[PDB]
Coordinates of C-alpha atoms and ligand atoms in Angstrom, one line a residue:
Chain V
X1 CA 59.3 94.8 113.8
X2 CA 59.1 92.5 111.0
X3 CA 58.0 95.0 108.4
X4 CA 60.5 97.1 107.6
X5 CA 63.3 94.0 107.3
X6 CA 61.0 92.4 104.6
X7 CA 60.5 95.5 102.7
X8 CA 64.2 96.2 102.9
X9 CA 64.3 92.7 101.4
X10 CA 61.8 92.8 98.5
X11 CA 63.3 96.5 98.0
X12 CA 66.6 94.6 97.5
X13 CA 65.7 91.8 95.5
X14 CA 63.6 94.0 93.2
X15 CA 66.6 96.0 92.5
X16 CA 68.8 92.5 92.1
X17 CA 66.7 91.8 89.6
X18 CA 67.4 95.4 87.3
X19 CA 70.9 95.7 88.4
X20 CA 71.8 91.8 87.4
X21 CA 71.1 90.5 83.9
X22 CA 71.9 87.6 84.6
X23 CA 70.4 85.8 87.8
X24 CA 71.2 82.6 89.2
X25 CA 68.3 81.3 89.7
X26 CA 68.4 81.5 85.3
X27 CA 72.4 80.8 85.2
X28 CA 71.8 77.5 87.1
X29 CA 68.7 76.2 85.0
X30 CA 71.5 77.2 81.4
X31 CA 74.2 75.0 83.9
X32 CA 73.4 72.5 85.5
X33 CA 69.8 72.0 85.8
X34 CA 69.2 71.8 81.6
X35 CA 67.0 73.7 80.0
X36 CA 66.5 76.2 75.9
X37 CA 69.9 76.8 73.8
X38 CA 73.0 75.3 75.5
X39 CA 75.4 77.3 76.0
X40 CA 78.6 77.2 73.8
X41 CA 81.2 75.4 75.2
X42 CA 85.3 76.4 75.3
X43 CA 87.1 73.1 75.9
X44 CA 90.6 74.0 74.9
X45 CA 92.5 76.4 71.7
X46 CA 90.1 75.5 69.1
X47 CA 86.8 76.4 70.3
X48 CA 88.6 79.1 72.0
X49 CA 88.8 80.5 67.9
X50 CA 84.7 79.8 67.1
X51 CA 96.7 85.8 71.1
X52 CA 95.0 83.0 73.5
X53 CA 95.3 83.5 77.5
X54 CA 95.9 87.6 77.1
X55 CA 92.7 87.8 75.1
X56 CA 90.9 85.8 77.4
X57 CA 92.2 88.1 80.2
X58 CA 91.0 91.2 78.7
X59 CA 87.9 89.9 77.4
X60 CA 87.2 89.0 81.8
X61 CA 88.0 93.6 82.2
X62 CA 86.0 94.2 80.0
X63 CA 83.2 92.0 82.0
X64 CA 84.5 93.3 85.0
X65 CA 83.6 96.6 83.9
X66 CA 80.4 96.4 82.8
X67 CA 80.0 94.2 85.9
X68 CA 81.1 97.4 88.3
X69 CA 78.4 99.8 87.1
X70 CA 75.7 97.2 87.3
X71 CA 77.2 96.7 91.3
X72 CA 77.6 100.5 90.9
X73 CA 73.9 100.9 90.2
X74 CA 71.8 98.4 92.4
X75 CA 74.2 100.6 95.4
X76 CA 72.7 103.2 94.7
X77 CA 69.2 101.9 95.3
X78 CA 70.3 100.9 98.5
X79 CA 68.0 102.5 101.7
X80 CA 70.7 105.4 102.8
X81 CA 73.2 104.6 100.7
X82 CA 73.6 107.8 98.7
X83 CA 72.8 110.3 101.6
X84 CA 76.1 109.3 103.0
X85 CA 79.1 110.9 102.0
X86 CA 79.7 111.4 98.7
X87 CA 84.2 110.4 98.9
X88 CA 82.3 107.7 101.4
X89 CA 79.9 106.2 98.6
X90 CA 82.9 105.8 96.1
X91 CA 85.5 104.0 98.7
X92 CA 83.1 101.5 99.9
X93 CA 82.1 100.5 95.7
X94 CA 86.2 101.1 95.2
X95 CA 87.1 98.2 97.7
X96 CA 83.4 96.4 97.8
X97 CA 83.1 95.7 93.9
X98 CA 86.0 92.7 93.7
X99 CA 84.5 91.3 96.5
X100 CA 81.0 91.8 94.7
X101 CA 82.3 90.1 91.0
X102 CA 83.8 87.1 92.7
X103 CA 80.6 86.2 94.7
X104 CA 78.3 87.3 92.1
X105 CA 80.1 85.1 89.7
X106 CA 79.8 82.1 91.9
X107 CA 76.1 82.0 90.6
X108 CA 77.7 81.1 87.3
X109 CA 79.7 78.6 88.4
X110 CA 80.2 75.2 89.3
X111 CA 83.3 72.1 89.9
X112 CA 83.4 72.0 85.9
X113 CA 83.5 75.5 84.2
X114 CA 82.2 79.5 84.2
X115 CA 78.9 80.5 82.0
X116 CA 80.4 83.5 80.6
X117 CA 78.7 85.9 77.8
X118 CA 75.2 86.7 78.7
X119 CA 75.2 82.8 79.6
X120 CA 76.0 82.5 75.5
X121 CA 79.0 80.3 76.8
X122 CA 80.3 78.3 79.0
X123 CA 84.0 78.5 79.2
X124 CA 85.4 74.9 81.4
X125 CA 88.2 74.9 84.2
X126 CA 90.6 73.2 83.0
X127 CA 90.7 74.8 79.7
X128 CA 91.6 77.9 82.3
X129 CA 93.9 76.5 84.3
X130 CA 96.2 75.5 81.0
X131 CA 96.9 78.6 80.8
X132 CA 100.3 79.8 79.7
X133 CA 102.0 80.5 83.4
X134 CA 100.1 83.4 85.5
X135 CA 97.1 83.1 83.3
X136 CA 96.3 79.4 84.6
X137 CA 95.8 80.6 88.3
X138 CA 94.0 83.6 87.2
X139 CA 90.0 81.5 88.1
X140 CA 91.5 78.3 90.1
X141 CA 90.6 80.2 93.2
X142 CA 87.3 81.4 92.1
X143 CA 86.5 77.7 91.8
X144 CA 87.3 76.7 94.8
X145 CA 85.6 79.4 96.7
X146 CA 82.9 79.0 94.6
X147 CA 82.1 75.4 94.8
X148 CA 82.7 76.1 98.9
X149 CA 80.3 78.9 98.8
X150 CA 77.1 77.1 96.3
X151 CA 77.4 74.0 99.2
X152 CA 75.2 77.4 101.2
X153 CA 72.5 76.7 98.2
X154 CA 71.7 80.4 98.1
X155 CA 68.6 81.9 95.6
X156 CA 68.9 85.2 94.3
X157 CA 66.6 86.5 96.7
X158 CA 69.0 85.5 99.3
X159 CA 71.5 86.9 97.1
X160 CA 70.4 90.3 97.0
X161 CA 70.2 90.6 100.8
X162 CA 74.3 89.6 101.1
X163 CA 75.3 91.9 98.6
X164 CA 74.3 95.6 99.8
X165 CA 76.0 93.6 103.8
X166 CA 79.2 93.3 102.0
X167 CA 78.8 97.0 100.2
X168 CA 78.4 98.6 103.9
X169 CA 81.1 97.2 105.3
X170 CA 82.1 100.3 107.7
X171 CA 86.1 99.4 107.9
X172 CA 86.7 99.6 104.6
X173 CA 90.3 102.0 104.3
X174 CA 90.0 106.1 104.4
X175 CA 86.4 106.5 105.3
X176 CA 84.9 109.3 106.6
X177 CA 81.8 108.6 108.3
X178 CA 82.1 105.5 110.1
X179 CA 79.1 105.7 111.5
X180 CA 75.3 105.9 109.3
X181 CA 77.7 102.5 107.1
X182 CA 77.7 100.3 110.3
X183 CA 73.9 101.7 110.7
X184 CA 73.1 100.6 107.8
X185 CA 74.4 98.0 107.6
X186 CA 72.9 96.7 110.9
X187 CA 69.7 96.6 109.3
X188 CA 71.1 94.4 106.2
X189 CA 72.4 91.9 108.2
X190 CA 69.0 92.2 110.5
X191 CA 66.9 92.1 107.1
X192 CA 69.5 89.2 106.4
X193 CA 69.6 86.8 109.1
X194 CA 65.4 87.1 108.6
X195 CA 64.9 85.8 105.0
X196 CA 67.2 83.1 105.6
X197 CA 64.7 82.1 108.6
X198 CA 62.4 82.6 106.6
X199 CA 63.2 80.8 103.1
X200 CA 65.8 78.7 104.3
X201 CA 64.3 77.7 107.5
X202 CA 66.0 73.6 107.8
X203 CA 69.2 75.4 107.3
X204 CA 71.1 75.4 110.8
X205 CA 73.2 78.8 111.5
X206 CA 73.2 79.7 107.8
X207 CA 73.0 83.3 108.4
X208 CA 76.4 82.9 110.5
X209 CA 77.5 80.4 108.3
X210 CA 77.7 82.8 105.2
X211 CA 79.3 86.0 107.0
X212 CA 82.1 83.7 107.3
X213 CA 82.0 82.3 104.2
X214 CA 83.2 86.5 104.1
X215 CA 86.8 85.2 105.2
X216 CA 87.2 82.9 102.4
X217 CA 86.3 85.9 99.7
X218 CA 88.9 88.8 101.2
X219 CA 91.9 86.4 101.1
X220 CA 90.7 85.2 97.4
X221 CA 90.5 89.7 96.4
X222 CA 93.9 89.6 97.9
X223 CA 95.1 86.7 96.4
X224 CA 94.0 88.8 92.8
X225 CA 95.0 92.3 93.4
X226 CA 98.3 89.7 93.6
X227 CA 98.2 88.2 90.9
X228 CA 96.9 91.6 88.8
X229 CA 100.0 93.7 89.9
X230 CA 102.2 90.9 88.8
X231 CA 100.6 90.8 84.7
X232 CA 102.3 93.9 84.6
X233 CA 105.6 92.2 84.4
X234 CA 104.1 90.1 81.5
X235 CA 103.2 91.8 78.4
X236 CA 103.8 96.1 79.5
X237 CA 95.4 100.3 72.9
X238 CA 95.8 103.6 74.1
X239 CA 92.6 105.2 75.6
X240 CA 92.0 101.3 76.7
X241 CA 94.8 101.9 79.3
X242 CA 92.3 104.6 80.6
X243 CA 89.0 102.8 80.5
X244 CA 90.8 100.0 82.4
Chain B
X1 CA 66.7 73.4 123.5
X2 CA 67.9 76.6 125.0
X3 CA 68.7 74.5 128.3
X4 CA 71.6 72.5 126.2
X5 CA 73.5 75.5 124.7
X6 CA 74.0 77.0 128.3
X7 CA 75.4 73.5 130.0
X8 CA 77.8 74.4 126.5
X9 CA 78.1 77.5 126.6
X10 CA 79.0 77.0 130.9
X11 CA 81.1 74.1 129.9
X12 CA 83.4 76.1 127.7
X13 CA 84.0 79.1 130.3
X14 CA 85.1 76.9 132.3
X15 CA 87.5 74.6 130.2
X16 CA 89.0 78.2 128.5
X17 CA 89.5 79.7 132.3
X18 CA 91.5 76.9 133.3
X19 CA 93.4 76.4 129.7
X20 CA 94.6 79.8 130.1
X21 CA 96.2 81.5 132.9
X22 CA 96.1 85.2 132.5
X23 CA 91.8 86.2 131.1
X24 CA 90.5 89.2 130.1
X25 CA 88.9 90.0 132.9
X26 CA 93.0 89.9 135.0
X27 CA 94.4 91.7 132.0
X28 CA 91.6 94.5 131.5
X29 CA 91.6 94.8 135.8
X30 CA 95.4 95.3 135.7
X31 CA 95.3 98.0 132.7
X32 CA 92.8 99.5 134.6
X33 CA 92.7 101.8 137.9
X34 CA 91.1 99.4 139.6
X35 CA 93.5 96.8 141.1
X36 CA 96.8 98.6 142.3
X37 CA 97.7 95.4 144.0
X38 CA 99.1 94.4 141.3
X39 CA 100.7 97.8 138.9
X40 CA 102.5 96.9 136.1
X41 CA 106.4 97.2 135.3
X42 CA 106.5 99.4 132.1
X43 CA 108.6 99.3 129.1
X44 CA 108.5 102.5 127.0
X45 CA 112.5 102.6 126.2
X46 CA 116.2 100.9 125.9
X47 CA 116.6 101.4 129.3
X48 CA 113.4 100.9 131.6
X49 CA 113.9 97.6 128.9
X50 CA 117.2 96.6 130.5
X51 CA 115.0 97.7 134.4
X52 CA 112.3 95.3 133.6
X53 CA 115.2 92.4 133.0
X54 CA 120.2 92.6 120.2
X55 CA 117.3 94.3 121.3
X56 CA 114.5 94.0 118.5
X57 CA 115.8 90.6 117.8
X58 CA 116.0 89.5 121.8
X59 CA 111.9 91.2 122.5
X60 CA 110.9 88.6 119.5
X61 CA 112.8 85.6 120.6
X62 CA 110.3 86.2 123.8
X63 CA 107.5 86.6 121.3
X64 CA 107.7 82.9 120.3
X65 CA 108.3 81.2 123.3
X66 CA 105.0 83.1 124.1
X67 CA 104.1 81.8 121.1
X68 CA 104.5 78.0 121.9
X69 CA 103.2 78.1 125.2
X70 CA 100.1 80.0 123.6
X71 CA 100.3 76.7 120.9
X72 CA 99.8 74.4 124.8
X73 CA 97.3 76.5 126.2
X74 CA 95.4 76.6 122.4
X75 CA 95.9 72.8 122.4
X76 CA 94.9 71.4 126.0
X77 CA 92.6 73.4 125.9
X78 CA 90.3 72.3 121.6
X79 CA 90.5 68.9 123.9
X80 CA 88.1 70.1 126.3
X81 CA 85.6 71.3 122.9
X82 CA 83.3 68.5 122.8
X83 CA 83.7 66.2 119.7
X84 CA 87.0 67.4 119.0
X85 CA 89.1 64.5 120.1
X86 CA 87.2 62.2 118.5
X87 CA 86.9 63.4 114.8
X88 CA 90.2 61.5 112.6
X89 CA 93.4 62.6 114.3
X90 CA 94.8 64.2 111.0
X91 CA 92.1 66.3 111.0
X92 CA 92.8 68.0 114.6
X93 CA 95.9 69.0 113.4
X94 CA 94.5 70.4 110.5
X95 CA 92.0 72.4 113.0
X96 CA 94.6 73.9 116.0
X97 CA 97.1 74.4 113.0
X98 CA 94.9 76.5 111.6
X99 CA 92.9 78.1 114.3
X100 CA 96.0 78.7 116.4
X101 CA 97.0 81.9 114.8
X102 CA 93.9 83.9 114.6
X103 CA 92.8 82.4 118.5
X104 CA 96.3 84.3 119.3
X105 CA 95.5 87.7 118.4
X106 CA 91.6 87.0 119.3
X107 CA 93.3 87.1 122.7
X108 CA 96.2 89.2 121.9
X109 CA 93.6 91.9 122.2
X110 CA 92.7 91.1 125.4
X111 CA 96.0 92.2 126.5
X112 CA 96.1 95.7 124.9
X113 CA 94.8 99.1 124.5
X114 CA 95.7 101.6 122.6
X115 CA 99.0 102.1 124.4
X116 CA 100.6 98.9 124.4
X117 CA 100.3 95.2 125.7
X118 CA 100.8 93.4 128.5
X119 CA 103.8 90.4 128.7
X120 CA 105.4 88.0 131.5
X121 CA 101.7 87.2 132.6
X122 CA 100.7 90.7 133.0
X123 CA 103.5 92.0 135.1
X124 CA 104.9 94.1 132.5
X125 CA 104.0 96.4 129.9
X126 CA 105.1 96.6 126.5
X127 CA 104.4 100.5 124.8
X128 CA 103.4 100.6 120.7
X129 CA 105.0 103.2 120.7
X130 CA 108.4 100.8 121.4
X131 CA 108.1 97.7 119.4
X132 CA 106.7 100.2 116.7
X133 CA 110.3 102.1 117.5
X134 CA 111.5 98.3 117.0
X135 CA 114.6 97.8 113.7
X136 CA 114.8 97.0 111.0
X137 CA 110.7 95.6 109.9
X138 CA 110.6 94.4 113.7
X139 CA 109.0 97.9 114.4
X140 CA 106.3 96.8 112.1
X141 CA 105.2 93.1 113.9
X142 CA 102.9 93.9 116.9
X143 CA 101.5 97.7 115.2
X144 CA 98.5 95.7 112.7
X145 CA 97.6 93.4 116.0
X146 CA 97.5 96.6 117.6
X147 CA 95.1 98.2 114.9
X148 CA 93.0 95.0 115.3
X149 CA 92.6 94.8 119.0
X150 CA 91.1 98.4 118.8
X151 CA 88.8 97.2 116.6
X152 CA 88.2 93.8 118.8
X153 CA 87.7 95.4 122.0
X154 CA 85.2 98.0 121.0
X155 CA 83.0 95.2 120.9
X156 CA 83.5 94.8 124.5
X157 CA 83.4 90.9 124.9
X158 CA 84.4 89.2 128.4
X159 CA 86.0 85.7 128.7
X160 CA 82.4 84.2 128.3
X161 CA 81.9 85.7 124.8
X162 CA 85.3 84.2 124.4
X163 CA 85.0 81.1 124.9
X164 CA 83.1 80.0 122.5
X165 CA 84.0 82.0 119.7
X166 CA 87.5 80.6 120.1
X167 CA 85.8 77.1 119.9
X168 CA 83.8 78.2 117.3
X169 CA 87.4 79.4 115.6
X170 CA 89.1 76.0 115.4
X171 CA 86.1 74.2 114.5
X172 CA 86.3 75.6 111.3
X173 CA 85.9 73.1 107.8
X174 CA 86.7 75.4 106.0
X175 CA 90.3 74.1 106.8
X176 CA 92.0 73.5 103.8
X177 CA 93.3 69.5 103.3
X178 CA 89.9 68.1 105.4
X179 CA 89.3 64.4 104.8
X180 CA 86.1 64.6 106.6
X181 CA 84.3 68.3 106.6
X182 CA 80.6 66.9 107.8
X183 CA 81.7 66.4 111.7
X184 CA 83.5 69.7 111.8
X185 CA 80.1 71.0 111.0
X186 CA 78.2 69.4 113.3
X187 CA 80.2 70.6 115.4
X188 CA 80.5 74.5 114.8
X189 CA 77.1 74.5 114.0
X190 CA 75.8 73.5 117.8
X191 CA 79.0 76.0 118.4
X192 CA 77.2 78.4 116.6
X193 CA 73.8 78.6 118.2
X194 CA 75.5 78.4 121.3
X195 CA 77.4 81.6 120.9
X196 CA 74.6 83.7 119.5
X197 CA 72.6 81.9 122.8
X198 CA 75.3 83.9 124.5
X199 CA 75.3 87.0 123.2
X200 CA 71.9 87.5 123.3
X201 CA 71.8 86.9 127.0
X202 CA 74.9 88.5 127.8
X203 CA 74.5 91.6 125.3
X204 CA 70.4 91.4 124.8
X205 CA 71.4 95.7 124.3
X206 CA 73.9 94.9 121.6
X207 CA 72.4 94.7 118.6
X208 CA 73.7 91.7 115.3
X209 CA 77.1 91.7 117.6
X210 CA 76.9 87.8 116.8
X211 CA 76.9 89.2 113.3
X212 CA 79.6 91.4 113.8
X213 CA 81.8 89.4 116.1
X214 CA 81.3 86.5 113.1
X215 CA 82.5 89.3 110.4
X216 CA 86.2 89.4 112.6
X217 CA 87.4 86.5 111.0
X218 CA 88.3 88.4 108.6
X219 CA 90.2 90.8 109.9
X220 CA 91.6 87.7 112.3
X221 CA 92.5 86.2 108.8
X222 CA 94.3 89.0 106.9
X223 CA 95.8 89.1 110.2
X224 CA 97.6 86.7 109.9
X225 CA 98.4 86.3 105.8
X226 CA 100.2 89.6 106.8
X227 CA 102.1 88.5 109.4
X228 CA 103.3 85.2 107.8
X229 CA 104.8 87.3 104.9
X230 CA 106.7 89.6 107.2
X231 CA 107.7 86.4 109.0
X232 CA 109.5 85.1 105.4
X233 CA 111.1 89.0 105.0
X234 CA 112.3 88.0 108.9
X235 CA 114.0 84.7 108.0
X236 CA 116.4 85.8 104.9
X237 CA 117.4 89.5 106.3
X238 CA 118.5 87.1 109.8
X239 CA 120.5 84.1 108.6
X240 CA 121.3 83.5 112.1
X241 CA 118.4 84.0 113.9
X242 CA 116.1 80.6 114.6
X243 CA 112.5 79.8 114.2
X244 CA 110.8 77.3 116.8
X245 CA 109.7 73.8 114.3
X246 CA 106.5 74.1 115.9
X247 CA 106.0 76.8 114.4
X248 CA 107.7 76.6 111.6
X249 CA 105.1 73.6 111.3
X250 CA 102.2 75.1 112.1
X251 CA 102.8 77.7 108.7
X252 CA 103.4 76.6 104.8
Ligands
QMH1 C1 96.1 81.8 123.3 C2 97.1 83.3 124.2 C3 97.4 83.8 123.7 C4 98.6 84.6 124.2 C5 99.4 86.1 123.9 C6 100.4 86.3 123.2 O1 100.8 87.7 122.6 C7 101.2 87.5 121.4 C8 101.4 88.2 119.9 C9 102.1 87.8 119.0 C10 102.8 86.2 118.6 C11 103.4 86.4 117.5 O2 102.9 87.3 116.9 N1 103.9 85.2 117.8 C12 104.8 84.4 116.1 C13 104.4 83.7 115.9 O3 103.8 83.0 116.4 O4 104.0 83.4 114.4 C14 106.3 85.2 116.1 C15 106.6 85.6 117.2 C16 106.8 83.6 116.7 C17 103.3 85.6 120.0 C18 101.3 85.6 120.3

């Protein structure tokens, strides 16, 4: 029934808006859209100031922890999610949040850099590439993914449903009851397909193209966690370890 | 029009049957009760292994050979995909380089069940437990392929579905280093329309099978990525082990 599918779409859109402060629509206005208060631009060490690589890294960590809580709130609004086994809800968020972070990060990126701090700042791609060894390879693969992903020209109403699809995967390790998860994801996939078909009537197979982006996305996450483990041999703040 | 898409699907199934000597139909026939006109000989230990005729490397070289053959069969198939041989020659190479192992592991699932895998064009059957028990790191080689295959075969796809899916894999366009992405995209969009119709027609009760199948491309990518890491280990522990130049060229 096309009626519960669009009820589902609107529901997810509304809660996406509620949960995530900076929407793609707003970010685009600030980015390549040329809006009311341009972002402060960080393009070098001097602009940054107004111990670099580490403090940038730690700032990204702070932001990612905030993002985990926004994503968590959003997840609990996906119909059926809270009714799942509690351990499974934890497992889904645990393995899903990285994929979602980089997906949503794309909304704040163009080929030349990324919005930071509620959209108040813009950090250039080239500046990020110029960071001391380990740290300069951090964001580059995320930029490469973002350019490809942004070529799809999704809006927030599309992204809301896609994010929900990622969360309800089914193949996360250690899941206790895979069936209701895949049943919910089947429904979200139906709602996503219909959404892209209505929202983007002239973009053939947009649904298929979007699902294929998950392949690059998961590689990116795998490579990132690999990198994350290498900085445990670079610099090796009490209660702070624990927070992160 | 739906009709053009059916004709494309028929052409691809046809080319598939002509390119790949052991179909899923035949493999499932061998694996199940079924056709007991050609029951396979089963390899589950060393002694049965020599009846069928180091132990771990010999099997690995046997498997390298099957890889180089599979690259040929896949290349012959790729040529049948409408538009493929018209592409920039460099992009033909790139598509094959990145597509070949994702296809090999897709098709390998057709030859597997939870218990083992068909070998030697279906004349033999090698146990999953036997493979797992191989020395060193050779025992870790096939196990994630089995894990994928038991999940992949739960989609209950047949050869007519697989023919189009395998073409979609080849014509990716998010492949690294492609010169002209647009014509590749146009071909894949046709192939995807063809695949979506095929699944809706062949599996009308199977909800969102199309999406579920596309999601499996994530599993394939991860299998390849892990398999490459395992090979880098093998070549450094066994300095006397030889990898085929074709395969070396595919890997980076
Ligand atoms: C497309 C036809 C599929 C034939 C299936 C062959 O079964 C295989 C299963 C595994 C492998 C495999 O991992 N080969 C490796 C590779 O090519 O990197 C190594 C052994 C050469 C090769 C073949």
